[PDB]
Amino acid sequence: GSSGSSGVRVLSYDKEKLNWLYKDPQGLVQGPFSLTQLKAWSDAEYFTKQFRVWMTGESMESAVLLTDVLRLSGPSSG
């Protein structure tokens, strides 16, 4: 647990650590998950376009679209 943050931290898009929460359609918050997992599921027909995701201890409302997280942290030249 051990939440905190003094100020404007750096934040990074980790495909490695489990850092990204989501709210399911039962209404429950699950996870967190890594961007590799959320990506692979977004690449595997587990989810729909209207799927936002937020980092561990951010607001559910700073949740961005998963399909843009995939573009934000992803390959260059495109």
Helix (H) or strand (E) holding 65: strand 64-65
78 domain residue, yes or no: yes
Distances (CA, A) of 10 to 13, 37, 45: 10, 22, 32
Experimental method: NMR
User: Would you report the helix, strand and coil content of the chain in percent, each value rounded to 5?
Assistant: 25, 20, 60
11 domain residue, yes or no: no
In which domain, by residue range, is 63 found? Answer: 18-78
46 domain residue, yes or no: yes
CATH number, residue 54: 3.30.1490.40
Preceding omega of 75 cis (within 30 degrees of 0): no
Domains in the chain, number = 1
Helix (H) or strand (E) holding 30: strand 29-33
61 domain residue, yes or no: yes
